[PDB]
Amino acid sequence: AQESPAFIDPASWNTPFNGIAQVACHNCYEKQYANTFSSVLDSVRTLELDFWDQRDAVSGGSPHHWFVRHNPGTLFQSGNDNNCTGDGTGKNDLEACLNDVKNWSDKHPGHFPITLILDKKQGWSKESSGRTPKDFDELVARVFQGKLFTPQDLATHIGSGAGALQGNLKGKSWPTANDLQGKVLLVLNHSENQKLSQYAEARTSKAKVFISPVTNGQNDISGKVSGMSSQSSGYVAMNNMGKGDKSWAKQAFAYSHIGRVWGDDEVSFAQHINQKINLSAYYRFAAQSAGGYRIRPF
Ligand SMILES: [Ca+2]
């Protein structure tokens, strides 16, 4: 039984995922934007977590653990400042926030696929510190288990190697929202494409997470991506654009890469749909809609 909340246009279900436009949150883990992280799923199906290795900028990390907060430092002695389960006791870490999504998914069989933007704020560790790309994949896999849909799954769907998604996606359809019912898609962002390139080089076709580089030219979609190796560029199936770079969403769309645009809150959802944006990130997500919908086909 496919879910039927009013904000989903039912035409979405038989549309390839790359042909669907969504209202997404921007930084909805912050208390100012929602009372609980779980509540965000009352309004949208694309969420975001900002995650840190250390308790402040320089200290306090532990293996196989990351903190969730906006700023390099917080007055909360826990190193967490967010609306996930544990908010009020300091136990509201990345794993807790991921578990909020997992638990919501278990309670809503047949849900529209959930996309989580994981906005990484520090560099990767080496093996001894327990926060490598492999450790990150192990965490997300432990939490979500078989809920995940990964780059290799997409590559199989389109008949490509995962390291040739970049160009082989052009002209192809992702699975439909119906095909993806009950699934979770994880996306890695960082201000520096080098950290995405480090992730992809480490994980290759085993990656649990889609990389989505900062995009401000054609080459960041289909060429040697700024800040990345050739190898890492080939795994790109998603692209991340700030407001000033949103014209590139039309080329993400052309390449069947999932484009996200953030920072463009004064522009309507309907306008963003005309601009071929898959994921339009809004701080005030519940206030956005087009003809009553927050998810609809282009
Ligand atoms: Ca963010």
- What is the residue-wise DSSP string for 226-272? TTS-HHHHTT--EEEE-GGGGGGHHHHHHTT-EEEE-S-TTS-HHHH
Q: How far is the CA of 280 from the centre of ligand 1 (A)?
A: 13
Task: Give the alpha-carbon dihedral of 99, 8, 24, 34, to 10 degrees.
Answer: -60
In one letter, which amino acid is 249? Answer: A
Q: Separation of 35 CA from ligand 1 center, angstroms?
A: 18
Buried b (16+ CB within 10 A) or exposed e, 189-216: bbeebbbbbbbbebbbeebbbbbbbbbb
Q: One-letter amino acid identity for 180? A: L
Q: What is the torsion angle, in degrees rounded to the nearest 10, for the CA atoms of residue 143, residue 144, residue 149 and residue 150?
A: 10
First vs last C-alpha separation in the chain: 24
Q: For the sheet with 258-261, list strands across it.
A: 238-241, 258-261, 279-282, 20-25, 295-297
3-state secondary structure of 115: strand
Sole residue written with tokens 């906005």: 119
Q: Give the residue ranges of DSSP H helices in the chain.
A: 94-107, 133-144, 151-158, 165-168, 193-203, 219-222, 230-233, 249-254, 269-274
User: Ligand 1 centroid vs 31 CA: distance in angstroms?
Assistant: 14
3-state helix, strand, coil in the chain (%, to 5): 35, 15, 50
CA distance 248 to 218: 7
Compute the distance from residue 190 Cα to the ligand 1 centre, in Å.
9
The rounded Å distance from CA 261 to ligand 1 centre is 12
Distance CA 241, CA 166 (A): 17
Query: CA separation (Å) from 287 to 47, 83, 141, 181, 274?
Result: 15, 19, 33, 25, 19
Distance CA 138, CA 140 (A): 6
Resolution (A): 1.5
Question: What sign results for the dihedral spanned by CA atoms 174, 179, 181, 182?
Answer: negative
How many Å apart are CA 88 and CA 7, to the nearest integer?
31
Distance 189 CA to ligand 1 centre (A): 8
Two tokens at 134? 């492999």
Give the amino acid at 202. A
Closest CA to 109 of 192, 60, 181: 181
CA distance 22 to 40: 14
Q: What tokens appear for 251 in the block?
A: 């080329």
């965000």: which residue's tokens? 40
Whole-angstrom distance, CA of residue 49 vs CA of residue 290: 25
Instruction: Judge whether 148 and 141 are in contact, CB under 8 Å.
Output: yes
What are the b/e assignments for 154-166, b being 16+ CB within 10 Å?
A: bbeebebebbebb
Assess contact for 101 and 117: CB atoms under 8 A: no
Domain extents in the chain = 1-298
User: What's the length of the chain?
Assistant: 298
Kindly tell me the number of DSSP H helices and DSSP E strands found in the chain.
9, 10
Residue 2 burial (10 A CB sphere; 0-12, 13-18, 19+): middle
Residue 208 makes CB contacts below 8 A (sequence gap 6+) with: 136, 137, 140, 141, 148, 150, 186
Q: How far is the CA of 159 from the centre of ligand 1 (A)?
A: 33
Instruction: At 117, give phi and psi (nearest 5°).
Output: -85, 115
| Residue 296 contacts residue 12 (beta carbons within 8 Å) | yes
Place of tokens 């956005």: 288
CA angle 172, 187, 181 (to 5 degrees): 65
- Structural biology method used: X-ray
Question: 50 CA to middle of ligand 1, Å?
Answer: 5
Separation in Å, CA 107 to CA 37, 100, 110, 147, 217? 15, 11, 10, 13, 41
**Bridge pairing between strands 67-68 and 46-52:** antiparallel
- Of 210, 207, 235, 209, the closest CA to residue 222 belongs to 235
